[PDB]
């Protein structure tokens, strides 16, 4: 069998702080997009805006009916457990959610202890039954660019959680999302943060295919507006724990899907874009 998992930072900032980023329309464009189809599990990042995020989740309901709540937005029975530094008084939620075409046996949220109370950043854990197999998928979004030291602490909390969970070593355990750890020009430096990421989580390095960056101001219309001169970076991953079932093959493919044109007005000026987010999605293929 093959497991298909995708992760995508969808840039859905709160409309209370950023009213004109086309969040609602992109909720519809992403929901109907072909690139996000045919997956087993999908991890979402930055689904911060409550209305637009729920709209997106609703549009994905037909194909991915099994869904978790958004990390850090609530702490009721919608979560089997709410772990970590969760606060109901944080201005924003963690923006992470997971949807699947398969039954979800357990849903857990965990809020990171440290961070440079702004957003309940952390991770979402899911135990999913796919064809009589239980697979484990953790979705997260780490500290954005001292920042590296914070990310290492967060990665540590993720690894510590996995070990404590007592997951069978013959079942697949994947960790994915916007790690904010750059692979560009770092794949050949055992001392880079990119290298440390794999050590801290004790995960294997996947085969890389597709586009060469996940946040590219040189090809992405949204990133180009916000950071015109910033060199492209590679920050999104989906990797497997070596302390559990090691995939004979695991790929991470960066896609460059373009959306139908959409327009927004900001300060009496109209702007048109053809991207779903400032980040590109990463499609993982895992041989089981
Ligand atoms: Mg972002
Ligand atoms: Mg929110």
Q: Which residue spans within 184-248 are E strands per DSSP?
A: 207-210, 236-240
Experimental method: X-ray
The number of the ligand nearest the C-alpha atom of 279 reads 1
Ligand 2 (ion): which residues have CB within 5 A? 48, 50, 93
Element (H, E) at 273: strand 269-273
Dihedral angle, C-alpha 57, 60, 65, 70, nearest 10 °: -20
How far, in Å, CA of 168 to CA of 133, rounded? 12
The number of the ligand nearest the C-alpha atom of 74 reads 2
Domain boundaries along the sequence of the chain: 1-288
PDB resolution in Å: 1.8
Residue with tokens 């794999």: 198
CA of 245 to the centre of ligand 1 (A): 31
CA of 220 to the centre of ligand 1 (A): 13
CA of 216 to the centre of ligand 1 (A): 12
**DSSP state at residue 241:** B
Angle in degrees, CA 281, 253, 52, rounded to 5: 10
The number of the ligand nearest the C-alpha atom of 16 reads 2
The number of the ligand nearest the C-alpha atom of 70 reads 2
Neighbours of 21 (CB within 10 A): 22
List all residues 6 or more positions away from 108 whose beta carbon is below 8 Å from its beta carbon. 79, 80, 81, 82, 83, 124, 125, 126
CATH homologous superfamily of 1-288 equals Endonuclease/exonuclease/phosphatase (3.60.10.10)
């Amino acid at each position: 069998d093959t497991l298909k998992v995708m992760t995508h930072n969808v840039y859905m900032l709160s409309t209370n702080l950023y009213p004109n980023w086309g969040q609602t329309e992109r909720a519809d464009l992403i929901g109907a997009a072909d690139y996000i189809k045919n997956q087993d599990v999908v991890i979402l990042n930055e689904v911060f805006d409550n209305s637009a995020s729920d709209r997106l989740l609703g549009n994905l309901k037909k194909e991915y009916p099994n869904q978790t709540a958004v990390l850090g937005r609530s702490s009721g029975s919608e979560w089997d457990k709410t772990l970590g530094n969760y606060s109901s008084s944080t201005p924003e939620d963690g923006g992470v959610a997971i949807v699947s075409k398969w039954p979800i046996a357990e849903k857990i949220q965990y809020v990171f202890a440290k961070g440079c109370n702004l957003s309940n950043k952390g991770f979402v854990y899911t135990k999913i039954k796919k064809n009589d197999r239980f697979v484990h998928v953790i979705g997260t979004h780490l500290q954005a660019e001292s920042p590296a030291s914070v990310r290492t602490n967060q990665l540590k909390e993720i690894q510590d959680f996995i070990k404590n969970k007592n997951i069978p070593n013959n079942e697949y355990v994947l960790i994915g999302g916007d790690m904010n750890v750059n692979k560009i020009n770092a794949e050949n430096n055992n001392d880079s943060e990119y290298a440390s990421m794999f050590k801290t989580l004790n995960a294997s390095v996947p085969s890389y295919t597709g586009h060469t960056a996940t946040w590219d101001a040189t090809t992405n219309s949204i990133a180009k507006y916000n950071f015109p001169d910033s060199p492209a970076e590679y920050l999104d991953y989906i990797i497997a724990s070596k302390d559990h079932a090691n995939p004979s093959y695991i790929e991470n493919k960066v896609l460059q899907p373009k959306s139908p044109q959409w327009t927004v007005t900001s300060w009496f000026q109209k702007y048109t874009y053809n991207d779903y987010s400032d980040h590109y999605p990463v499609e993982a293929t895992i041989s089981m």
